[PDB]
Scaffold this active site. Structure first.
Site, mmCIF file in Angstrom:
data_model
loop_
_atom_site.group_PDB
_atom_site.id
_atom_site.type_symbol
_atom_site.label_atom_id
_atom_site.label_comp_id
_atom_site.label_asym_id
_atom_site.label_seq_id
_atom_site.Cartn_x
_atom_site.Cartn_y
_atom_site.Cartn_z
ATOM 1 N N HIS A 256 0.817 -1.232 0.000
ATOM 2 C CA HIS A 256 0.000 0.000 0.000
ATOM 3 C C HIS A 256 0.841 1.269 0.000
ATOM 4 O O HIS A 256 0.421 2.295 -0.528
ATOM 5 C CB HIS A 256 -0.863 0.031 1.260
ATOM 6 C CG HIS A 256 -1.612 -1.201 1.465
ATOM 7 N ND1 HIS A 256 -1.681 -1.789 2.698
ATOM 8 C CD2 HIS A 256 -2.384 -1.910 0.646
ATOM 9 C CE1 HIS A 256 -2.432 -2.867 2.615
ATOM 10 N NE2 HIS A 256 -2.845 -3.005 1.366
ATOM 11 N N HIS B 292 5.146 6.945 6.675
ATOM 12 C CA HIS B 292 4.958 6.520 5.333
ATOM 13 C C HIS B 292 4.468 7.707 4.520
ATOM 14 O O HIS B 292 4.155 8.754 5.082
ATOM 15 C CB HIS B 292 3.945 5.348 5.225
ATOM 16 C CG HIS B 292 2.604 5.744 5.715
ATOM 17 N ND1 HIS B 292 2.221 5.667 7.031
ATOM 18 C CD2 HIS B 292 1.564 6.331 5.069
ATOM 19 C CE1 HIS B 292 0.989 6.182 7.158
ATOM 20 N NE2 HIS B 292 0.565 6.613 5.977
ATOM 21 N N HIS C 140 2.042 9.018 0.844
ATOM 22 C CA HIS C 140 1.116 8.800 -0.241
ATOM 23 C C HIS C 140 1.554 9.710 -1.399
ATOM 24 O O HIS C 140 2.006 10.833 -1.138
ATOM 25 C CB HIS C 140 -0.352 9.165 0.155
ATOM 26 C CG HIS C 140 -0.786 8.481 1.402
ATOM 27 N ND1 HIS C 140 -1.434 7.281 1.392
ATOM 28 C CD2 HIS C 140 -0.564 8.770 2.719
ATOM 29 C CE1 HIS C 140 -1.608 6.899 2.669
ATOM 30 N NE2 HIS C 140 -1.093 7.761 3.479
ATOM 31 N N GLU D 113 -3.319 13.414 0.352
ATOM 32 C CA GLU D 113 -4.613 12.981 0.883
ATOM 33 C C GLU D 113 -5.407 14.212 1.340
ATOM 34 O O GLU D 113 -6.463 14.501 0.808
ATOM 35 C CB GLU D 113 -4.385 11.937 1.984
ATOM 36 C CG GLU D 113 -3.761 10.657 1.439
ATOM 37 C CD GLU D 113 -4.080 9.457 2.247
ATOM 38 O OE1 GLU D 113 -3.872 9.515 3.475
ATOM 39 O OE2 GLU D 113 -4.484 8.450 1.622
ATOM 40 N N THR E 293 -6.500 6.682 7.215
ATOM 41 C CA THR E 293 -6.882 6.892 5.816
ATOM 42 C C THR E 293 -6.806 5.646 4.976
ATOM 43 O O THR E 293 -7.087 5.683 3.779
ATOM 44 C CB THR E 293 -6.080 8.013 5.170
ATOM 45 O OG1 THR E 293 -4.719 7.603 4.998
ATOM 46 C CG2 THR E 293 -6.203 9.318 5.903
ATOM 47 N N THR E 294 -6.441 4.485 5.602
ATOM 48 C CA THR E 294 -6.535 3.167 4.947
ATOM 49 C C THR E 294 -7.381 2.317 5.866
ATOM 50 O O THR E 294 -7.492 2.554 7.078
ATOM 51 C CB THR E 294 -5.152 2.553 4.773
ATOM 52 O OG1 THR E 294 -4.438 2.634 6.034
ATOM 53 C CG2 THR E 294 -4.391 3.211 3.695
HETATM 54 O O1 LIG Z 1 -3.048 0.513 6.591
HETATM 55 C C1 LIG Z 1 -2.888 0.097 7.707
HETATM 56 O O2 LIG Z 1 -1.973 -0.804 7.905
HETATM 57 C C2 LIG Z 1 -3.690 0.637 8.835
HETATM 58 C C3 LIG Z 1 -2.976 1.808 9.399
HETATM 59 C C4 LIG Z 1 -1.952 1.623 10.310
HETATM 60 C C5 LIG Z 1 -1.219 2.728 10.814
HETATM 61 C C6 LIG Z 1 -1.549 4.052 10.401
HETATM 62 C C7 LIG Z 1 -2.599 4.164 9.512
HETATM 63 N N1 LIG Z 1 -2.935 5.482 9.097
HETATM 64 O O3 LIG Z 1 -3.967 5.684 8.490
HETATM 65 O O4 LIG Z 1 -2.161 6.470 9.323
HETATM 66 C C8 LIG Z 1 -3.306 3.065 9.002
HETATM 67 ZN ZN LIG Z 2 -1.010 7.711 5.491
#
Ligand SMILES: O=C(O)Cc1cccc([N+](=O)[O-])c1
Ligand SMILES: [Zn+2]
Length: 257
Positions: free
Chosen positions: A61, A91, A93, A103, A195-196
């Site tokens: 992802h 991380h 995006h 985002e 956001t995931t």
């Molecule tokens: O996608 C994942 O694994 C879930 C997850 C885990 C840690 C942070 C997250 N976020 O939206 O910042 C999402």
């Molecule tokens: Zn994120």
């Protein structure tokens, strides 16, 4: 399972995660004209001098730079927050082109990318418990624009060839996340969600006003990553952003005039 295609992207997530249509979903558009200055907000305290990075992972992802979160070594405090929040991972995006990737948006402007530094509230003991609480996480969001290179990003960019595909990891010690911050810590804040998936409504969002600049070459290397696993049809890891969600009954507060 969920992703960012046509058949499995954001617009499908609600079927497996009905909280996708909830009251406090993220990201959102930040309307700079309606966000009100809140003099009661504190300066943010970002204490990353003792941070211990461990590993970088392609999770299919995004890529996560993971930290040792077994003690209060890299913490976020102050700002809108009560208590102490430990850095677990960051991380990004990003887009297929420089004109999208973030985002959050600012007056509907999309940045080329967005960095998320994810922290959990130590009062809940562990990350998994924290995501079950409305004040469990604090995510520091930083926009990326394309211009000059970010020197402090280059160590990340150069390891990405070693984690091209889903499920690959690499040792990633001694990385200093301070080198990813802009000069100012002025911010907007609002209550929202991961956001995931699972899209849990556990996040105090802190979105910095000042973007960092990265070079075209740096973002191009993000776009060489793969969503797929090794030896699977290659599908470039691009456009791994959720679009803005309805603000609903929320207010976005500014730390600055
Ligand atoms: O996608 C994942 O694994 C879930 C997850 C885990 C840690 C942070 C997250 N976020 O939206 O910042 C999402
Ligand atoms: Zn994120």
């Amino acid at each position: 399972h969920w992703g960012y295609g046509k058949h499995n992207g954001p617009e499908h997530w609600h079927k497996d995660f009905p909280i996708a249509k909830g009251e406090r979903q993220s990201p959102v558009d930040i309307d700079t004209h309606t966000a009100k200055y809140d003099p009661s907000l504190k300066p943010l305290s970002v204490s990353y001098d003792q941070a211990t990075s461990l590993r970088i992972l392609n999770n299919g992802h995004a890529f996560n730079v993971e930290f040792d979160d077994s003690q209060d070594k890299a913490v976020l405090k102050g700002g809108p927050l009560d208590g102490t929040y430990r850095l677990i991972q960051f991380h990004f995006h990003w887009g297929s082109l420089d004109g999208q990737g973030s985002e959050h948006t600012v007056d509907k402007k999309k940045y080329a990318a967005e960095l998320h530094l994810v922290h959990w509230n130590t009062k809940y003991g562990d990350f998994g418990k924290a995501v079950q609480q409305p004040d469990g996480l604090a995510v520091l969001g930083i926009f990326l624009k394309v211009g000059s290179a970010k020197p402090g990003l280059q160590k990340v960019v150069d390891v990405l060839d070693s984690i091209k595909t889903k499920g690959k990891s690499a040792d990633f010690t001694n990385f200093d996340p301070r080198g990813l911050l802009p000069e100012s810590l002025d911010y907007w804040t609002y209550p929202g969600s991961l956001t995931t998936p699972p899209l849990l409504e556990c996040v105090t969002w802190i979105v910095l006003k000042e973007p960092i600049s990265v070079s075209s070459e740096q973002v191009l290397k993000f776009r060489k990553l793969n969503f797929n696993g090794e030896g699977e049809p290659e599908e470039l890891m691009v456009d791994n952003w959720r679009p803005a969600q309805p603000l609903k009954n929320r207010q976005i507060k500014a730390s600055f005039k």
